[PDB]
């Protein structure tokens, strides 16, 4: 049973507990939110998939392609507790809940065990200028100024050229990086990648 959980629902209905919508927020509180209020289904922008699909259009994130380039940050859409027309059932009957949520230890092995045992987690790392140009390989910060913290999805690990890495999913579409994925140095708490791992177990109901 695979459901595409709506980012929109999370971004817009989590109040100030999550932070401030499009002006960034708190990963850990996002997990908590799902535990308390749950989350509906919702696919990609203008997919008509699920109850609350994403309403902010895609763009070109530091790359060239057909899409207009990402503007910066815009407006946080409104929390509307109703499903898009054409979707059945009700908003409330579409809610998916968490049993729990917890922080994973700043430890390579703990993070490895968690993924292996329960699946992809969420982490965050500080983004430096050289990161934007990521194409392939294992990312390692050398040059460039800092930009900020950036939450991501860690779903695996490996070693390349004896350089161990974390397999991560970015949300800058598929035409950024390696078909939307990147690899970053592991075991050195690089760019703070093993520092803010959070996960949780769904509610089999």
């Amino acid at each position: 049973v695979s459901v595409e959980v709506s980012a929109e629902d999370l971004l817009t209905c989590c109040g100030s507990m999550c932070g401030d919508g499009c002006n960034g927020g708190y990963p850990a509180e996002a997990w908590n939110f799902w535990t308390r209020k749950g989350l509906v289904s919702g696919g990609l922008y203008e997919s008509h998939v699920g109850c609350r699909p994403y309403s902010i259009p895609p763009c070109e994130h530091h790359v060239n392609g057909s899409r207009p380039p990402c503007t910066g940050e815009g407006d946080t859409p409104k929390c509307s507790k109703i499903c898009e027309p054409g979707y059945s059932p009700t908003y409330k009957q579409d809610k998916h809940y968490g049993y729990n949520s917890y922080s994973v230890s700043n430890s390579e092995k703990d993070i490895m065990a968690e993924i292996y045992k329960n699946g992809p987690v969420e982490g965050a790392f500080s983004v430096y200028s050289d990161f934007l140009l990521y194409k392939s390989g294992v990312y390692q910060h050398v040059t460039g100024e800092m930009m900020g913290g950036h939450a991501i999805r860690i779903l695996g690990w490996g070693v390349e050229n004896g350089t161990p890495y974390w397999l991560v999913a970015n949300s800058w579409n598929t035409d950024w990086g390696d078909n939307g994925f990147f690899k970053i140095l592991r075991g050195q708490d690089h760019c703070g990648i093993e520092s803010e791992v959070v996960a949780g177990i769904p509610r089999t109901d």
Partner: protein, 47 residues
């Protein structure tokens, strides 16, 4: 633990594991990280 692990191979029956979203012009990555991993785990922990 294995030397290499890729959730996308381990759980091919969960299509969300391979999916790439777009947060667009918004600092919502905190939410994407979340609903992406949540999507995945629902599929993993369910029959």
């Amino acid at each position: 633990l294995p030397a290499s692990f890729d959730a996308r191979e381990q759980w091919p029956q969960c299509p969300t594991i391979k999916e790439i979203r777009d947060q667009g012009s918004c600092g919502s990555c905190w939410a994407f990280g979340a609903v992406e991993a949540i999507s995945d785990r629902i599929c993993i922990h369910t029959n």
